[PDB]
């Protein structure tokens, strides 16, 4: 009786699982490492910090290797809570990687809201929001100290650190763009805030100090790291309206062997707002009573899963106008790609496609290699806006075609792509293959 | 004009939109060694025997299908013993 | 094809020994499919990235990526 | 600074970091055979409706196949709080067959079960979003559900199936569309009068190989060690007010099983695994004066408040012998899944792994059921003595009791998941055992 | 004139306003073969 009644029971079919085994699960053997030892140290920010102001840090020699960077906000509420939405995020307009003088990467506030919105899940998300946001119903006037994270290769894992070390004559910087305006701390929709706080801002970078065999190493060696870089472009929406269905042929003009494709639409006055606005619950400011508004989002409430005030009706990539895959719905790109290729929940209005087993992995998993297309392109049919977004019967109890009236407001389109290239450091140098 | 190729009999064959080149493309390949249980093809062996009829039995039984209990009964492969690769169908085109 | 193509190794929900512990090998330093905490290129005698069979630099990795394998 | 770390070294390290063995700063990866994906529609053989059995086969456009998807388009019956999770209810069933034989079968209450033990966080909730209404959605709303299958292909591309190498094996799938889904179609026992049919398609995810792999695959024998689903139906010995009813159920399983997992239902109701009460979300208009205890809030029929679970505890019997100590029901609800899954399994949803990881593909310990001539599962129920119609007659209960309404869950469905092995050779495939 | 009986001299006509097909496409195993056109594309181009 008891587990032994079952470990005496080995029949032929266990022959494939147990017999002349090759591992076990009782011991584990732990590999030993490298001498390292990870310290926060503050850079020097250049330039007058400030709402749309430009400002950047060179990053010290001080450690050996750089990973981790978190660039830190004080900002201060310009009206009660339900006035914010990532407000840090949305301060830091973008940020551009510069090593030896040559551009690698840059990213953007609305990519930092993709990102998040389509990779981060469950807790992190929350937890990246309390890093970002204000999210215990505080009110006018208070004083947080944010937290922005930047998501470049090098800042998400130690087997991509930039040896800095290895760069004996050349810099490696950060340039940062304040936004002019931020949602809930100088501006209410386009009212200025009088009495307005400008942000402190502070950068800081976590640094790897290694041990002597491996310090002079990576000082001496030449160095190659396969490294992600976004590409991104901005571009007008095909707006749909109460009697059509738009619908739009857009180039994709990326290059590299991209992971995946992800976009969404939104109303640029809004930050984060990928959907349209209306008079139900968390639609829009003041849904659910007589001061609703469908001009307006509850800033605090403006990201939603629901689907109905999204505007993709169906989409396709083609590669020199051949389809890149069968057409499927905008909800197809909105929960089943990142179910199957992420695992978390994405917002209506944002959409993926990969083209990778794990969009997620550091390890290549599939590709569409751009710089091989001559005419990628991506087809967008859009949703019909007949809904009266002002009417919760309308907007709740609708089809898979059509979305809010408002949803016309979804005038920008937004395609990023990320892709894999090389850094390449050699003799005290470096800069990227291509 | 296929004169170098795997002739079944006297038919070439074609699987993936090519010409069967040699043995080793078809999928028998893979268990060409072994004593398969039946080829596919079932050429029956000359003529099959005539159904016997009679008055007697089929009126004394009226019906009831009696089966006879004594025959082969050629037993399949047992749930524990895997399937054995004999139970494969050889697909012998040629 | 004259290659010793393995099979998969895909991140493993658990950890794994491959019973062979006296002699450490160093193609299971780098095998996803048993360790499930970091992963790191291995080091030789003096520091120096050893490269398992198999495997593939980031230069070598990014030229079958962008360029494209054999045969 | 990080230099104090380090020099801070002694023999406490040499384990640690004596005598490197990986270092964390530099990623190796490793060449992979080049592949695309690419989504395909496979059409449906018979008429799609409710009731009505339809089927598909998936034809050779690419070599092998992982992921499928089908979806449905479903309209609401009623307002919001009357469908529960209902792409899924619908789906009741779907057998995969393969050269004809029938290598596996997943049904509605398993998908139920499945998720209820084994997704989690935001990769349930985005599975929510995929197969029901979770924005509050009005009466005629209509909207497109994803349901991914997950049969052993479906879930990583390590068991993609080889099409390519069954010149002579079509594969299929027979999908059972339920007569009946709640909030769609009928409302309880009464249909909805006007209710649309559904619209069904079934999306394929093929993977198109190179040309050396292409060859291995049409050349090379093969073996997948893959999973199967085990399912029969019981009726509860049902408790009552008076007592505690026992229950032996023989389990006529075979193969190495990786875990047991069960659950008592209400067949009228889908998903609904534990009793009715007047307490919030425990049944329709539950707190209120219009709350009955015949019929579940539908929108929440699932439930954490195991006072509404039918089991008091369980053992598994191998040929007569405990297995494992009596457990409280609690304990398979729980525990288990605590400890092999790290996900939460609402009450009426039991969970017995044989396995350390039964969340994995990688076997990890097995109960070979085809050495077990006599298994048994054996149940003991709780009282069914609370006025389920008195908030504080369950809220305030003990661990022997339950709600008088505990009676309805008549049914139980026990499961077994286990390891089989696929071969595959001379174009054509089936299991090795039974 | 009778809308509901031909001319059975002249049943056949080139004016495709009378023709019922507004546009077209063919799929091959879930695939577009072509994107779709105006039933005249069928009618005229095709056979052009």
């Not at chain 1, 990467?105 to 946001?133: E, P």
């Not at chain 2, 079944?8 to 249980?37: T, W």
Request: overall charge negative; hydrophobic content about 35%; aromatic content about 12%.
């Amino acid at each position: 009786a008891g587990g032994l009644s079952q470990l005496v029971a080995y029949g032929a079919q266990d022959v494939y699982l147990t017999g002349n085994p090759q591992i076990t699960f009782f011991k584990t053997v732990y590999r030993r490492y490298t001498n390292f030892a990870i310290e926060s140290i503050q850079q020097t920010i250049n330039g007058s910090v400030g709402f749309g102001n430009k400002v950047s840090t060179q990053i010290s020699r001080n450690g050996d290797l750089i990973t981790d960077i978190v660039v830190e906000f004080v900002l201060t509420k310009g009206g009660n809570g339900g006035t914010t939405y990532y407000p840090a995020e949305e301060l830091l307009q973008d940020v551009e990687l510069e090593i030896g003088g040559q551009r690698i990467d840059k990213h953007y506030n609305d990519w930092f809201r993709t990102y998040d919105a389509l990779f981060r899940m469950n807790d992190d998300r929350y937890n990246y929001r309390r890093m970002t946001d204000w999210v215990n119903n505080e009110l006018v006037g208070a004083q947080k100290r944010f937290y922005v994270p930047l998501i470049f290769f090098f800042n998400q894992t130690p087997g991509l650190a930039l040896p800095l070390i290895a760069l004996q004559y050349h810099e490696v910087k950060l340039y940062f763009t304040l936004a002019s305006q931020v949602q809930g701390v100088n501006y209410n929709g386009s009212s200025a805030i009088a009495g307005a706080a400008q942000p402190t801002m502070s950068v800081w970078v976590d640094y790897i100090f290694l041990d002597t065999q491996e310090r002079t190493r990576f000082a001496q060696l030449p160095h190659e790291y396969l490294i992600e870089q976004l590409q991104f472009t901005g571009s007008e929406t095909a707006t749909p309206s109460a009697t059509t269905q738009a619908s739009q042929n857009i180039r994709l003009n990326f290059n590299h062997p991209t992971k995946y494709l992800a976009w969404n639409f939104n109303n640029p006055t809004n930050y984060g707002q990928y959907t349209a606005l209306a008079n139900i619950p968390g639609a829009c400011s003041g849904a659910g009573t007589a001061a609703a508004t469908v001009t307006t989002p509850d800033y605090g409430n403006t990201g939603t899963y629901n689907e109905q005030l999204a505007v993709l009706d169906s989409a396709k990539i083609q590669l020199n106008g051949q389809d890149r895959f069968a057409t499927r719905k905008g909800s197809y790109f909105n929960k089943v790609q990142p179910y199957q290729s992420i695992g978390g929940v994405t917002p209506a209005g944002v959409y993926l496609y990969s083209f990778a087993l794990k969009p997620a992995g550091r390890q290549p998993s599939g590709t569409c290699n751009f710089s091989r297309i001559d005419n990628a392109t991506l087809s967008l049919t859009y949703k019909t806006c007949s809904i009266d977004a002002t009417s919760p019967a309308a907007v709740l109890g609708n089809t898979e075609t059509v979305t809010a009236n408002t949803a016309t407001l979804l005038t920008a389109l937004n395609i990023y792509a990320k892709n894999y290239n090389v850094l390449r450091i050699m003799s005290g140098m470096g800069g990227l293959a291509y | 004009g296929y004169e170098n190729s795997y002739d079944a009999n006297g038919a070439r064959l074609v699987m993936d939109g090519k010409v069967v080149k040699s043995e080793c493309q078809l999928p028998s390949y893979q268990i060409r060694n072994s004593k398969h249980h039946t080829q596919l093809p079932m050429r029956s062996l000359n003529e099959p025997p005539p159904m016997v009829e009679d008055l007697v039995d089929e009126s004394l039984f009226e019906g009831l299908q009696g089966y006879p209990v004594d025959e082969k009964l050629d037993l399949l492969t047992p749930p524990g013993t895997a399937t054995p690769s004999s139970e494969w169908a050889a697909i012998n085109y040629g | 094809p004259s290659y010793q193509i393995r099979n998969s190794k895909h991140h493993t929900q658990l950890p794994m020994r491959s019973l062979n512990e006296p002699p450490p090998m160093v193609e299971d330093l780098v095998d996803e499919s048993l360790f499930e905490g970091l992963q790191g290129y291995p080091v030789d005698e003096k520091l120096d990235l050893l490269t398992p069979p198999g495997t593939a630099t980031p230069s070598s990795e990014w030229a079958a990526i962008n360029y494209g394998l054999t045969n």
